[PDB]
C-alpha cells in the first residue's frame, strides 16, 4: 500500500526504511534492548508526566511573576496564566533544557521566594533529569545483561 502511494507522492518511500527494523533480523540485538521492557519505559514516561504535572501545579499556585518569557521587553508571553499552557511549557522546555527548569525562567532573587524557588528548581533538576532519565537509561542497560 505504501509502495503504491509512493507514486502519488515520492515520499512514502521513506516508510520503507522501517523494514530494516520490522523486517530482517540484523538489528534484533540492538532493538531487543528497547523492546524487552517496553511496559517499563511507558510507565516511566507516565511517572515523569505525573511528576511534571505536580511541579506544574506547584508553580501555577506559587510562582506567578517568574514565567515572563518576553522578547524585546514589555511583551509578556508564554506565562503560567493557564494550567494547560504552563504544563505544556514545562513538559516541552524544562525536560529538554538539560539543566532543569531554573535556567529557562527569571532569576529567583525576589524576597519570600529566594529559597523556596531555589529548592523548587534543584528538586526539579534532581528528580526529573537526574533520577528519572537515569531510570530510562538503566532500563536499556539492564536489557543487554
Amino acid at each position: 500500500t505504501m509502495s503504491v502511494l509512493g507514486h502519488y507522492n515520492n515520499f512514502f518511500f521513506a516508510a520503507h526504511l522501517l523494514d530494516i527494523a520490522m523486517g530482517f533480523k540484523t538489528l534484533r540485538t540492538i532493538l531487543s534492548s528497547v523492546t524487552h521492557n517496553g511496559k517499563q519505559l511507558v510507565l516511566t514516561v507516565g511517572l515523569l508526566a505525573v511528576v511534571v504535572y505536580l511541579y506544574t501545579v506547584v508553580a501555577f499556585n506559587f510562582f506567578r511573576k517568574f514565567y515572563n518569557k518576553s522578547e524585546d521587553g514589555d511583551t509578556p508571553d508564554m506565562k503560567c496564566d493557564d494550567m494547560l499552557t504552563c504544563y505544556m511549557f514545562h513538559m516541552y522546555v524544562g525536560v529538554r533544557a538539560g539543566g532543569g527548569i531554573g535556567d529557562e525562567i527569571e532569576d529567583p532573587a525576589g524576597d519570600e521566594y529566594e529559597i523556596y524557588r531555589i529548592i523548587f528548581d534543584i528538586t526539579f533538576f534532581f528528580f526529573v533529569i537526574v533520577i528519572l532519565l537515569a531510570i530510562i537509561q538503566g532500563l536499556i542497560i539492564d536489557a543487554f545483561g
Partner: peptide, 20 residues
C-alpha cells in the same frame, strides 16, 4: 525574609548541645 535567617534558626537549636 528567610534566605539568611533560615541557617541562623537552624543553628539556634544546637545551643542546647553547645551548653552540654
Amino acid at each position: 525574609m528567610t534566605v539568611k535567617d533560615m541557617v541562623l534558626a537552624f543553628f539556634s537549636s544546637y545551643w542546647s548541645v553547645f551548653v552540654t
